[PDB]
């Protein structure tokens, strides 16, 4: 499979999440995703085919994971936006007020702005701290997906949101959305990963 940020992958033939970003760790290929998506050694599939396994994760507390891929996989410096792509150029952290988009398998590519940093989410499992909040909307299944600026700077991976009964927060005004993502920089240094860019 071609590994592009935003695309669907399954975990142990049951939950779905979205790919965050292609990365490497020496000769190993992988992608970063959300911690709550799978446990260590869970099998990841893209399109019915095994692409890799969860190599490490931290959830709750933080919400981060990276999946190590087999070498057959093609890592690409790209995030899906409909039939188009946004090139990943780097990982400069954007400030509050900055515009940002996110990509996932449930709501596709959505944009909004960053509204606050260092938010705590109190999920059923425990708190996750240090999250950035944006008001771009998202839905169940978008976990793990890319948050990136149009400029191509990788911000983080989708963690959670104030979901409504329709499975997303896209039908409430931007003002009432709390879409939270895990920052990329701590995940990259914690696992010693380098982002694939183009």
């Amino acid at each position: 499979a071609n590994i592009v940020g935003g695309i669907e992958y399954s975990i142990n033939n049951a939950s779905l999440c979205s790919v965050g970003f292609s990365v490497t760790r020496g000769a190993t290929k992988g992608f970063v995703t959300a911690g709550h998506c799978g446990t260590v050694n869970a099998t990841a599939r893209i399109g019915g085919a095994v692409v890799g396994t969860f190599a490490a994760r931290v959830f709750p507390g933080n919400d981060r994971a990276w999946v190590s891929l087999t070498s057959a996989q093609t890592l690409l410096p790209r995030v899906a936006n409909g039939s188009s792509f946004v090139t990943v150029r780097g990982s400069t952290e954007a400030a509050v007020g900055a515009a940002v988009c996110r990509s996932g398998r449930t709501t596709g590519y959505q944009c909004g702005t960053i509204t606050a940093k260092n938010v705590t989410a109190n999920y059923a499992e425990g708190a996750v701290r240090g999250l950035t909040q944006g008001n771009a909307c998202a839905g169940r299944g978008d976990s793990g997906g890319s948050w990136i600026t149009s400029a191509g700077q990788a911000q983080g991976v989708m963690s959670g949101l104030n979901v409504q009964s329709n499975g997303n927060n896209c039908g409430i005004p931007a003002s009432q959305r709390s879409s939270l993502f895990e920052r990329l920089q701590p995940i990259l240094s914690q696992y010693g990963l380098s982002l694939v860019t183009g």
């Binding site: 959300a34 059923a124 299944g141 976990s143 989708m158 959670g160």
Partner: peptide, 4 residues
């Protein structure tokens, strides 16, 4: 807010 819930995971995702």
């Amino acid at each position: 807010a819930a995971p995702l």
